Amino acid sequence: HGEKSQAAFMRMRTIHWYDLSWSKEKVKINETVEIKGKFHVFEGWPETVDEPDVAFLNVGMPGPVFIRKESYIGGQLVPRSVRLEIGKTYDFRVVLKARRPGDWHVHTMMNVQGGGPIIGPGKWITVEGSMSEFRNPVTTLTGQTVDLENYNEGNTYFWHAFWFAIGVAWIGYWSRRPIFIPRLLMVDAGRADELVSATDRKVAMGFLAATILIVVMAMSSANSKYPITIPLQAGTMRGMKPLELPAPTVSVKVEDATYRVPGRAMRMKLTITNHGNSPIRLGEFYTASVRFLDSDVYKDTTGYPEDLLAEDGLSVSDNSPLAPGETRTVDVTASDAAWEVYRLSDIIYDPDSRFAGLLFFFDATGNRQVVQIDAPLIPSFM
Amino acid sequence: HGEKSQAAFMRMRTIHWYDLSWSKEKVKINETVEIKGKFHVFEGWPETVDEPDVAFLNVGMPGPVFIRKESYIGGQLVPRSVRLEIGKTYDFRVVLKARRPGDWHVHTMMNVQGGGPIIGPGKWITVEGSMSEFRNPVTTLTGQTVDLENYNEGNTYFWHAFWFAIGVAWIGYWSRRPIFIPRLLMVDAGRADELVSATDRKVAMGFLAATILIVVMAMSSANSKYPITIPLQAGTMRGMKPLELPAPTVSVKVEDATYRVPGRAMRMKLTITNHGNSPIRLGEFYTASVRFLDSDVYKDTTGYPEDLLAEDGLSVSDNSPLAPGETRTVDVTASDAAWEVYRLSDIIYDPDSRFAGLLFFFDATGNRQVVQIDAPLIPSFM
Amino acid sequence: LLDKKWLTFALAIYTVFYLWVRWYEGVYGWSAGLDSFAPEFETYWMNFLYTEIVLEIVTASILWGYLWKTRDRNLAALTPREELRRNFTHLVWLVAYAWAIYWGASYFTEQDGTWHQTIVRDTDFTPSHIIEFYLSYPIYIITGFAAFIYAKTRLPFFAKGISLPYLVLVVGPFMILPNVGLNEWGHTFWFMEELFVAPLHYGFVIFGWLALAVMGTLTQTFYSFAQGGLGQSLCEAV
């Protein structure tokens, strides 16, 4: 939710998410669900999007229906913002604890600095149970173990009520007397200053002194309990460990790539050319969270969201094994309602008709090569 | 035109243009002329010039005496801005169609983002014929083939006249009556409001309704014809393919480099040292579009602009073959009127007396090595 | 008698002069006016500059000098009959101003606009700069002053104190010296390119808006007509 309405080419050429996995589809309050996967920052990152010098690994849900217990990019825990580097691929892992019963469409998203939430695929996960069951316990370096759900709640309330009351007390004191039309007129013809006197200005400084007093008393009383305190920990983590990918063995060349106006499909003419040594076939084109597969070649098992998986969405003019050393030009068509449902078809309103995806190739024994393509994508109407 | 007046060191240390070539020197209206070459973005790019994150491959001419039919950096067509990367070398190719008869000094220039047009060498090209001969045909994805010279001209005109007339019609209607000194006075002593009445305020809303009406009618009439339309395509192209250069086999070291005050020549003391295995000689120093050659060693054939080519401008204290493994210090002098004509001599007014060029070395069988030099360049007056 | 075609002078004097100019650059825009470091620029274009500046100081001194001395001393008692004739000639001065401004602020200005698009400038002294800034502007400022002074020296009403809208109308032009000159000046640090949206050009916009003081000047001119015994015959006959 919230992709779809955002620019189709931004979504194509920003972050590619793949090897996504979700440990469970249905979960009890206080239970864990773990999201894993990989993401590549696209080399041809759009100008309108500040490079991810300061990005944040977020979660796409309707509030804290889950709480994020842990998040990891590379090996490292990532509670801060982090600097991701264009071109690179990383592995992430989000760990969510369930908190609100219901049906949630959880996405994995990037908080991409200067303009943009970069929203990944969303998967429906169901929480069963009672919100009253939820606990969020945390043990401090100070000895005590507290529940974050309610920690310091009563305190917060007290101090707000107390001060609020005193505010009322002050207006209250003055409002025992009449407030407007007599006091207004007194000021007018002749002097005011009969309006306020001694029994008044003693209370004035009563309040004034009482207030400074209670603040400082309260503060160094709050310092007496809670003598060990740190500042808000913050600041972008640099040095994110990227993933070391083997150079791909296939190389592809995109000659023209077109889409039909009112349509649900994108054609592209690729020259696939298989270097390295095992007969290769094309099994998937991933584009904007939408995954198009040749089911003659590959089958998802990860339970990828049903509205984004086009089971035999991808058709190759010739998808016989491409022998090693051999190189051929092929016409490929990615086709599925998801192309219109997630509005990739809304590329026609974009100021930059260029697409970007990942192709996945598979050899005979089933190990895979990922090449990335991008090119201008041109409309055809007539 | 427009270099010369711009800072001499900016021109030395910004973009180096070499292997320039022009397919023709004289051309008929509607004929093509193709500019090719290479450019290197200098590693020591000046601070005052935003890095070329968003640069544009332009053409240096007096308006559309030619139209740019095509432009290419690397393999790719480049109608947008493009991100060039400091240190890298690229090959470009501009293709120009002739449109206005005359003598044009055509340059190849870079539109270098934050401050600066970076103007390359200019070559004189002559167009013969009649402007009335020029055609700029283009076939749309919509069926129709139009001439860009005049396409939509009449339309533009109509709508402007029509609306313009209506503006006049409105002031016209009010100006049948007297305009100033009676209407002014009426407002003054006593009330106005006799000035405008019924026969007036009907016309007022006549116009008002008529206008909204004609706009919306016109718009969805313009939508009826021309039902297929895209937005302005825009946005910086990333991923420019740079040129893969072999590591040079010669390395040079610039110890002092001086120029004479009122002069036409720059001396520099180089230690050339020939790694790799064929006796090498120095054949050219390129500096700011100005090319200085040792004609004992190299001869331009490309017809490089005559005011920028110093045929034997370059003299080496010892330009015998430099044996492989051998290394020598040599005194080199680049000398030619072009040094004063194109104002490289105006480096004395620059806040950064540092130069930058390309040296070209040639072995026995005539294959070449390009090393780049830069260093501080110091004046001498006495 | 009344208001002559001494006016036809005012309209054609600029028209002819500036049409000669448009021809003159028209032929030397290309030829000399492209490369400023050629010696044909220092003759057909630079000499043109020095000539005009000198001619402007002179004619300005003569034109203002003239009128200030021929200031009507015995203004106190001269007829409504001439308080009209003069009021009309004043209006001719204003037509001359407005026409002069047209050429400066609209014509040669947006022309320079096109010129920048088609050649990268070799000097702060391009042909269209020699004409836009140092010919066109001084001229309409001189015309401006003339009118102002004519009014102050020739008509009661305007002889009493200083008209603020008329002062703004003639001084705004003069203030556009650096205002329009900061065009290229300002745009050099953050961005040397002559982007008209740059803050360097905002002074030209502010001084250009001082031309709206013509509305206050015309209101005062028509009030000078009404004070001079006019606007009562046909006005009341209406």
Residues 244-283 of A with CB under 8 A from B: 261
SS3 track for B249-278: CEEEEEEEEEEECCCCEEEEEEEEEECCCC
Query: Helices in chain C by DSSP H: which ranges?
Result: 7-28, 41-44, 46-69, 80-101, 109-118, 127-131, 137-154, 164-185, 202-209, 214-227, 234-237
Q: Do C193 and B5 touch (CB under 8 A)?
A: no
Residues of B with Cβ-Cβ distance to A352 under 8 angstroms: 233-235
User: For B179, what's the count of Cα atoms within 13 Å in the CB-facing half-sphere?
Assistant: 8
Cβ-defined contact of A43 to B239 (cutoff 8 Å): yes
Pairing assessment for the beta strands B66-73 and A327-335 based on DSSP bridges: unpaired
CB C186, CB C201: distance < 8 Å? yes
What is the full DSSP assignment across A150-189?
TTTHHHHHHHHHHHHHHHHHHHHHHHTS--SHHHHHHHSS
Q: Closest Cα to residue B99, out of B136, B145, B72? A: B136
From residue C122, give the alpha-carbon distance in Å to each of B2, B16, C23.
5, 21, 22
Judge whether A231 is closer than 8 Å to chain B, CB to CB. Answer: no
**In this structure, what token pair is assigned to residue A274?**
């298989």
Of B75, B6, B39, B116, nearest in space to B286 by CA: B39
CA distance A327 to A314: 20
Q: What is the C-alpha separation between A214 and A212, in angstroms, rounded?
A: 6
Strand bridging mode B89-98 / B32-41: antiparallel
Backbone φ, ψ for residue A249 (5° rounding): -100, -20
Angstrom distance (rounded) from CA A57 to CA C95: 68
CA separation for the pair B199, C105 (Å, rounded): 39
Phi first, then psi: what are they for B364, rounded to 5°? -60, -50
What are the sequence ranges of the domains in chain A?
1-135+233-246, 136-232, 247-382
Q: State in Å, rounded, how far the first CA of chain B is from the last one.
A: 33
Q: Determine the residue type at A7.
A: A
Tell me: domain A136-232, CATH 1.10.287.710, correct?
yes
DSSP, collapsed to helix, strand or coil, labels residue A52 as: coil
Q: What is the DSSP string of A176-232?
A: TS--SHHHHHHHSSS--SSSS-TTTHHHHHHHHHHHHHHHHHHHHHHTTSS----PP
Helix, strand, or coil here: C84? helix
Nearest to A35 by CA among A99, A102, A106: A106
* Cβ-defined contacts of B301-308 (< 8 Å, 24+): B302/B20, B302/B21, B302/B22, B303/B22, B303/B25, B303/B123, B304/B20, B304/B121, B304/B123, B305/B121, B305/B122, B305/B123, B305/B124, B307/B338, B307/B341, B307/B342, B308/B121, B308/B338, B308/B342
- Where b means 16+ CB within 10 Å and e means fewer, B73-104 reads bbeeebebbbbbeeebbbbbbbbbbbbbbeeb
Rounded to whole angstroms, the Cα distance separating A352 from B237 reads: 10
State whether the Cα torsion C1-C5-C9-C14 is positive or negative: positive
What is the Cβ-side half-sphere exposure of residue B308, based on CA atoms within 13 angstroms? 23
Is A275 annotated to bind ligand? no
What are chain B's partners, defined as 3 or more CB pairs within 8 angstroms?
A, C
Between the alpha carbon of residue A169 and those of residues A95, A162, A182, A209, B62, the distances in Å are 48, 10, 22, 15, 80
B1-135+233-246 topology per CATH = Jelly Rolls (2.60.120)
Cα C97 from Cα C179, distance rounded (Å):
20
Residue A368 tokens read as 């895979």
DSSP β-ladder status, B145-147 and A117-128: unpaired
Estimate the crossing angle of helix C164-185 against helix C137-154, to 10 degrees.
Answer: 170
Alpha carbons C186 and C196: distance in angstroms, whole number = 11
Q: Are C150 and C166 in contact (CB under 8 A)?
A: no
The answer to whether A16 is annotated as binding is yes
Alpha-carbon torsion (A113, A115, A120, A124), positive or negative: positive
User: Does C118 contact B4 at a Cβ distance shorter than 8 Å?
Assistant: no
> Residue A90: how many CA atoms within 13 Å on its side-chain side?
25
Backbone torsions φ then ψ of C207, nearest 5 degrees: -70, -30
Resolution of the structure in the document, Å: 4.8
Query: Would the annotation count B105 as a binding residue?
Result: yes
Q: Which amino acid is at C142?
A: I
The position carrying tokens 């680049």 is B334
- Whether the CB-CB separation of B135 and B151 falls below 8 Å is answered with no
Three-class DSSP category at B295: coil
Q: Rounded CA gap, B258 and B331, in Å?
A: 11
Nearest to C123 by CA among C201, C202, C38: C38
Residues 6+ apart with CB under 8 A from A370: A18, A245, A248, A358, A359, A360, A361
SS (H, E, C) B165-224: HHHHHHHHHHHCCCCCHHHHHHHCCCCCCCCCCCCCHHHHHHHHHHHHHHHHHHHHHHCC
Q: Closest Cα of chain A to B237: distance in Å?
A: 8
**C120 contacts B60? CB cut-off 8 A:** yes
Buried (b) or exposed (e) across A275-285, using 16+ Cβ within 10 A? eeeeebbbbbb
Q: Phi/psi class of residue C27: alpha, beta or left (left: φ > 0; alpha: ψ in -120 to 50)?
A: alpha
The SS3 assignment for C209 reads helix
Residue whose C-alpha is closest to residue B11's, from B109, B133, B149, B99: B109
Is residue A106 within 8 Å of A123, Cβ to Cβ?
yes
Neighbours of C47 (CB within 10 A): 11
Of C122, C219, C231, the CB nearest to B5: C122
Measured CA to CA, the distance from residue C116 to residue C192 in angstroms comes to: 13
Chain A CA closest to residue B142: A382
Structure tokens that stand for B267 in this block: 């001396």
- List all residues 6 or more positions away from B136 whose beta carbon is below 8 Å from its beta carbon: B67, B97, B147, B148, B149
Task: Please name the residues in contact with A32: beta carbons below 8 A apart, sequence gap of 6 or more.
Answer: A23, A69, A95, A96, A97, A98
Per CATH, the number for C1-215 is 1.20.1050.50
**CA C172 centroid distance within chain:** 10
The reply to whether residue C34 touches residue B1, judged by beta carbons under 8 angstroms, is yes
**Residue B338, number of CB atoms within 10 A of its CB:** 24
| Beta-strand runs (E) in B300-349 | 309-310, 314-316, 327-335
Contact B274, B323 (CB under 8 A): yes
Integer Cα distance of A135 and B103 in angstroms: 83
Compute how many other C-beta atoms are within 10 angstroms of the C-beta atom of residue A82: 24
Q: Which residues pair with B127 in a beta bridge?
A: B27, B102
How far is the C-alpha of B9 from the C-alpha of B92, rounded, in Å?
24
Q: Which of residues 83-142 of B touch A (CB under 8 A)?
A: 141-142
Tokens 């308080």: give the residue: C83
Any B CB within 8 A of A381 CB = yes
Chains touching A by CB (3 or more pairs below 8 Å) = B
Phi, psi at B161, each rounded to 5°: -55, -50
Chains adjacent to C (≥3 CB pairs closer than 8 angstroms): B
By C-alpha distance, which of C236, C220, C230, C214 is closest to C85? C230
Q: How far apart (Å, rounded) are the C-alpha atoms in residues C148 and C153?
A: 9
Q: How far is A10 from A47, CA to CA, in rounded Å? A: 10
In this structure, how many other beta carbons lie within 10 angstroms of the beta carbon of residue A115? Answer: 10
Whole-number Å distance between alpha carbons of C35 and C121: 9
In the three-class reduction of DSSP (H, G, I as helix; E, B as strand; rest coil), residue C13 is classed as: helix
CA distance B313 to B282: 13
Can you give the C-alpha Rg of chain C in angstroms? 21
Identify whether the C-beta of residue B107 lies closer than 8 Å to the C-beta of residue B122. yes
Contacts of A265 (CB under 8 A, 6+ apart): A259, A333, A334, A335, A336, A339
- The first and second tokens of residue A177, run together, are 């007397």
Give the C-alpha separation, A340 to B111, whole Å: 39
Contact A352 B228 (CB under 8 A): no
Record the tokens describing residue C137, joined without a space: 């502007």
Q: List strands edge to edge, sheet with A117-128.
A: A26-28, A117-128, A102-111, A56-60
* All residues at 6 or more sequence positions from A221 whose CB lies less than 8 Å from its CB, including other chains: none
CA angle, residues C133, C134, C140, in degrees to nearest 5: 80
B247-382 domain in CATH 2.60.40.1580? yes
Query: Is A47 within 8 Å of B228 when comparing Cβ atoms?
Result: no
DSSP state of A132: G
Determine the Cα–Cα distance for residues B221 and A347; give it in Å rounded to an integer: 25
| Cross-strand bridge partners of residue A124 | A105
* Beta-carbon separation of B239 and A45 below 8 A: no
Distance CA C126, CA C181 (A): 13
Q: For residues A88 and A45, give the distance between their C-alpha atoms in angstroms, rounded to a whole number.
A: 12
- Closest Cα in chain C, distance from residue B132 (Å): 20
Which residue do the tokens 């028509």 mark? C222
Q: How many CA atoms lie within 13 A of B231 on its CB side?
A: 10
Chains C and B touch (3+ CB pairs under 8 A): yes
What is the rounded distance in angstroms from the CA atom of residue B339 to the CA atom of residue B299?
20
- The residues, ordered by sequence, that sit 6+ positions from B278 with a Cβ below 8 Å of its Cβ are B324, B363, B364, B365
Pairwise CA distance, residues B106 & B108, whole Å = 7
DSSP C5: T
Token reading at B344: 């490289």
